[PDB]
């Protein structure tokens, strides 16, 4: 039978290879190009990250929600995949035209010069594979296929490292940039192979179609994807600027390092919510079964993140020695605060994915505004006085009261 634990086991395997391939490539980035190349590729790598969400108009969470909803009805399933295929095709071709025509302005903003126009024109084809690969991974998530999604990410991570090494050893710095963009793009080969071998959907379902009522619903998931790409990231951006003002930019660096390894080890659990929790809650239409599934998920993820966080705290000196440069070994005190906030943030993700599974833009704006407001009140109170440590208390206290409000709002929604 399918459960969150079985999906977490397959997710933990793909996440182990994903962070391992990212650490290997990242270390090769530093040895080959150093801080100078790492600073030039900062805006480019962020573009690749936002392309993983914005290449297919961010409908992937809606694709997973509606594929699971219409997992039985074949006719409506054709219209879900058909409309999703047309939106991914139309948006990525429009993005490719924007990247190929305005290659000079984008290079001017991403690198400061115009010497990277050809790289931007190559991104136009790269983001096409990113959008299509993310779509195929969304369909496999809608059918709760944890093995198909994990195997596609693992194989795509291996050929992504080989492609980076081939492109870097051939084209050099611009080749290493193309390889960094090709790592999320080459997942379309294992995703397509896994899509037709397991036979989850016929290939004719990918033929572009248009359902008006279904295109507007996926458009609501586009608005939600556009909201997360600005709301909380801007809040954090304001936090680093306030920290860099009252203290040093390196004091922002020790807070970024603790949060970086926090994002890696939390991905063992958060990546399984889109494989099991999102499709399961979309099929459930009764509040009795929704309450049972949400409570059952909290019974598993809360001890899981708490055990994983504790072991990270016991190995916090090990992380600073390896994953960090071991430059400011005093950040070991920033761990316990961030790791407690990681536990309560994971618990609140269950209520957040329930909001996604029900396509509630109302409860979505409410959730993002609450986290934005609480993060900003606690940052202005702790950062100017406690430094990077206070930035962790602001992160911990925000999600301590956010999980409490999520529980209270869920209780009022149940009764």
């Amino acid at each position, epitope marked *: 039978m399918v459960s969150l634990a079985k999906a977490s086991l397959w997710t933990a395997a793909s996440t182990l290879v994903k962070i391992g391939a990212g650490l290997l490539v990242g270390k090769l980035l530093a040895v080959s190009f150093g801080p100078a190349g790492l600073g030039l590729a900062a805006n480019f790598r962020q573009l690749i990250t936002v392309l993983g969400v914005l290449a297919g108009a961010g409908i992937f969470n809606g694709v997973t929600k509606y594929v699971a909803q219409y997992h039985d009805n074949p006719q409506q399933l054709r219209r879900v995949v058909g409309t999703s295929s047309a939106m991914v095709l139309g948006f990525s071709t429009l993005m490719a035209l924007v990247f190929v025509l305005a290659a000079a302005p984008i290079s001017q903003g991403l690198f400061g010069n115009t010497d990277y126009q050809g790289l931007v024109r190559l991104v136009a084809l790269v983001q096409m594979g990113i959008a299509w690969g993310n779509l195929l991974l969304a369909l496999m998530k809608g059918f709760r296929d944890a093995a198909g999604n994990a195997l596609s990410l693992i194989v795509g991570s291996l050929i992504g490292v080989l492609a980076y090494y081939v492109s870097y050893r051939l084209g050099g710095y611009e080749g290493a940039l193309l390889g960094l963009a090709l790592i999320p793009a080459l997942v379309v080969i294992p995703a397509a192979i896994m899509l037709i071998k397991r036979g989850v959907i016929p290939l004719s379902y990918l033929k572009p179609s248009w359902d008006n009522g279904l295109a507007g619903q996926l458009s609501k998931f586009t608005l939600m994807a556009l909201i997360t790409s600005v709301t909380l990231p801007v809040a954090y951006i304001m936090m680093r600027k306030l920290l860099a003002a009252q*203290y*040093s930019w*390196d*004091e922002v*660096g*020790i807070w970024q390092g603790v949060s970086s390894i926090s994002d890696a080890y939390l991905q063992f659990i958060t990546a399984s919510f889109s494989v099991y929790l999102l499709p399961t809650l979309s099929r459930l239409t009764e509040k009795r079964d929704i309450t049972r599934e949400v409570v059952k998920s909290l019974k598993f993820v809360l001890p899981a993140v708490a055990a994983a966080s504790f072991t990270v705290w016991l190995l916090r000196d090990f992380a600073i020695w390896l994953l960090l440069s071991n430059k*400011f*070994t*005093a*950040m070991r*005190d920033l761990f316990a605060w961030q790791l407690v906030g990681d536990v309560l943030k994971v618990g609140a993700y269950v209520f957040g994915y329930l909001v996604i599974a029900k396509a509630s833009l109302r409860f979505y704006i409410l959730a993002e505004v609450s986290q934005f407001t609480l993060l900003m009140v606690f940052a202005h109170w702790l950062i100017p006085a*406690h*430094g*990077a*440590l206070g930035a962790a208390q602001a992160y911990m206290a925000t999600y301590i009261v956010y999980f409490s409000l999520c529980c209270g709002v869920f209780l009022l929604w149940r009764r």
Partner: nanobody
Amino acid sequence: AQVQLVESGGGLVQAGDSLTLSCAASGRTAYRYGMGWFRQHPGKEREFVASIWWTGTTTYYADSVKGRFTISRDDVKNMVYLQMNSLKPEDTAVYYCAAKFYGGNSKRPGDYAYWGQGTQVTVSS
């Protein structure tokens, strides 16, 4: 508990020469104490020179020592250093090192809890 601060260095140098002071910190969780250097003129109040944040990421300097002074800390040996360059005649004072738990961002001697015995730093114009 606390931390014990033992200063080292100083002496009779010439104007324009260089000198390095060292503050050894002995105690539990010595990495949590922000450290600062203070100097005291004959009978006058204690003045601020330089300091370091308890994480070792932000260094603070006085305007009179902005260009010629440099504070640092080795967290392995738990010792704070003050590299002094281009010694001018106003640098003749007793140089103290102070400590404060989760501190080191203040220019005031009251915001530091643990002090040590100073070193005699005097220049010969």
